[PDB]
Amino acid sequence: SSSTKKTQLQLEHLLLDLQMILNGINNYKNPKLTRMLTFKFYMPKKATELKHLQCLEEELKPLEEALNLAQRPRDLISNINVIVLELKGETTFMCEYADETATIVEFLNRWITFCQSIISTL
């Protein structure tokens, strides 16, 4: 299917954007890296299907906030938003968050692993 190729490329682009954000974070100087690891993110309890991307969508505003403190973030997050919303679509899904919060590093990596998990199935 042609639409399956659309889902694939969109997942590849989202994976790349998250990898790019993380790459810049890994190169931060010691005092800067320390301060951004205090910014807490909500994590998914389950992330095996495309509908679970609602957990990412809801956490894009904190992500835009964290990137603003460490610096364009407004434009980059808006681009990711479009892809995230398009990738999940049916009506409205309630997202279940884990008890323990994580840092930007664990947050990004989880969603990077999520994207890699779906790409391989199609």
Question: Looking only at residues 49 through 68 of this chain, which bind ligand FRI when binding is defined by CB under 6 A?
Answer: 59, 62, 66
* Residue number, 10 or 102, with CB nearest to ligand FRI: 102
3-state DSSP assignment of residue 97: strand
Residue 112 in contact with residue 18, Cβ under 8 Å?
yes
CB atoms within 10 A of CB 104: 22
Using only C-alpha atoms, the chain has a radius of gyration, in whole angstroms, of 14
CB atoms within 10 A of CB 20: 12
- # chain residues binding ligand FRI, by CB under 6 A: 23
The site for ligand FRI (CB under 6 A) is made up of 26, 29, 31-32, 34-42, 59, 62, 66, 69-70, 101, 103, 105-106, 109
Residues that bind a second copy (CB under 8 A): 30-35, 37, 65, 68-69, 71, 105-106, 109
